[PDB]
Amino acid sequence: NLKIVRMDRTAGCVTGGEEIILLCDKVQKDDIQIRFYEVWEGFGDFSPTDVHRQFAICFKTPKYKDVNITKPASVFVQLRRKSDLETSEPKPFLYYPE
Amino acid sequence: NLKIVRMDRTAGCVTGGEEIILLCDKVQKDDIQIRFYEVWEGFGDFSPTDVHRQFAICFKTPKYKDVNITKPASVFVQLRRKSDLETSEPKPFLYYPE
Numbered sequence: 001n002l003k004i005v006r007m008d009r010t011a012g013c014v015t016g017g018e019e020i021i022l023l024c025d026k027v028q029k030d031d032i033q034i035r036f037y038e039v040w041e042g043f044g045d046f047s048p049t050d051v052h053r054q055f056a057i058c059f060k061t062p063k064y065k066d067v068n069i070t071k072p073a074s075v076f077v078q079l080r081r082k083s084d085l086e087t088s089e090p091k092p093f094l095y096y097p098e
Numbered sequence: 099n100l101k102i103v104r105m106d107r108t109a110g111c112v113t114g115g116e117e118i119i120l121l122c123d124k125v126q127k128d129d130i131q132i133r134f135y136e137v138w139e140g141f142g143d144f145s146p147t148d149v150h151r152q153f154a155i156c157f158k159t160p161k162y163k164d165v166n167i168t169k170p171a172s173v174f175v176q177l178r179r180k181s182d183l184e185t186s187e188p189k190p191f192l193y194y195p196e
């Protein structure tokens with residue numbers, strides 16, 4: 001089962017598109033997503049080639065639901081397997097205004 | 099043989115101590131170093147537990163040789179095996195003034 005071991009950033013701008021490196025326990029590159037949620041949900045933008053040897057993922061943050069927030073919005077991020085929707089424990093993530 | 103596949107930062111402040119995540123091809127956690135060089139050399143600060151499943155390394159940058167530079171200093175970074183001193187191809191890295 002799924003685990004986010006580390007992320008180099010736990011915050012990002014509401015506009016999205018910012019690169020993060022996430023370290024995970026073993027995943028399958030074609031059966032993995034990164035889900036940001038609050039239910040609002042957005043997905044990390046990456047392809048299977050951005051999964052590094054099943055143990056890391058380089059991705060770009062999704063745009064948050066509201067790019068006009070005036071203060072930070074606390075969300076969660078989890079790994080999720082596409083096939084059976086199994087998830088990791090969530091990590092907090094802070095979206096901040098532009 | 100050794101390869102730096104990606105680093106989340108390719109620059110840092112001369113004072114060192116900044117966290118980087120490096121993605122690499124397979125290493126042994128007890129037989130790996132990260133060497134910054136220009137011969138001046140400094141080493142990434144990490145322990146074997148900071149090596150993630152042999153495919154990534156979380157480390158802190160070394161302090162540069164001169165913390166009083168007034169413009170950026172271009173150095174190289176390589177993986178190096180401690181046992182036999184085998185190295186990866188170098189990646190450029192820019193140190194910048196405080």
